[PDB]
Write a protein that binds this ligand. Structure first.
Ligand SMILES: NS(=O)(=O)c1c(S(=O)(=O)C2CCNCC2)ccc(-c2ccc(C3CCNCC3)cc2)c1-c1nnn[nH]1
Ligand SMILES: [Mg+2]
Ligand SMILES: [Zn+2]
Ligand SMILES: [Zn+2]
Length: 231
């Protein structure tokens, strides 16, 4: 009941929320097509460093994110992974790069970001091109579930905490619509969610790309949202 909501975060400010020991989500707000949306990413403690998952959706929000991390946590962000190519995940990569953060994404995400005219993470993450692939990256596992919200979407698991960050492939429980589906695969999405359910059955916290964290129920709910959109 304490997770910050969209009307509680002015555009340009970033909040952190402690999910588990050494795991936080970051919450920002941004405008798109004349509507304001909240957006989540993840921060995971990596020894005496931090791993960031996704930008705070924009250059100014991402600079505010780094400032918030500096005062709340006080460990340097050394690496960042973007979970798909859209602006709410890569917008702000140039700010990260100018702050010395090494930025990463799969080759699928990098090609799509390039074609879109979006900011491009510096480094390529191999070993994630086939559905069901998983690789280790510091304190997380990166998992490619197959096409869903986008063809390149990744999800992230924190094994020490049983936290699953779904990004935009996973919707919050209150969701009644599927968001931006222009690059989605509506037919494959439920199958990709089933793959996540099969691979991470011990997940205790599931974090969506937008909105409130919950439990494993966010996965089935997301498949249901997608089916309602298709119908
Ligand atoms: N990940 S993106 O598709 O580009 C994306 C962007 S975006 O700005 O990055 C991109 C910029 C270029 N033109 C297309 C949009 C914006 C809004 C949204 C957006 C987010 C949530 C929602 C609703 C909120 C109420 N509950 C149901 C979901 C609606 C929209 C998304 C998104 N992310 N995930 N799905 N869509
Ligand atoms: Mg309150
Ligand atoms: Zn997206
Ligand atoms: Zn999104």
């Amino acid at each position: 009941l304490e997770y910050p909501t969209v009307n509680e975060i002015p555009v340009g400010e970033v909040r952190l929320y402690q999910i588990a020991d050494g795991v936080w989500s970051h919450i920002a707000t941004q405008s798109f097509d004349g509507a304001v949306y909240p957006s989540n990413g993840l921060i995971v403690r990596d020894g005496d460093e931090l791993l960031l998952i996704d930008t705070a959706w924009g250059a100014k929000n991402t600079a505010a994110l780094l400032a918030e991390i500096e005062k709340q946590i006080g460990l340097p962000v050394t690496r960042a992974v973007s979970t798909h190519f859209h602006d709410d995940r890569v917008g702000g990569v140039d700010v990260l790069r100018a702050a010395g953060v090494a930025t990463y994404a799969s080759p699928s995400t990098r090609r799509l970001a390039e074609a879109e005219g979006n900011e491009i993470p510096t480094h390529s993450l191999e070993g994630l091109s086939s559905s069901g692939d998983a690789v280790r990256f510091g304190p997380v596992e990166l998992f490619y579930p197959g096409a869903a919200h986008s063809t390149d979407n990744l999800v992230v698991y924190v094994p020490s905490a049983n936290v699953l960050y779904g990004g935009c492939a996973v919707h919050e429980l209150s969701s009644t619509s599927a968001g931006n589906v222009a690059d989605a695969d509506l037919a494959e999405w439920p199958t990709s969610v089933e793959r996540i359910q099969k691979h991470y059955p011990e997940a205790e916290v599931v974090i969506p790309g937008h909105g409130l964290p919950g439990g494993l129920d966010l996965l089935q709910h997301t498949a249901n949202v997608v089916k309602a959109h298709k119908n």
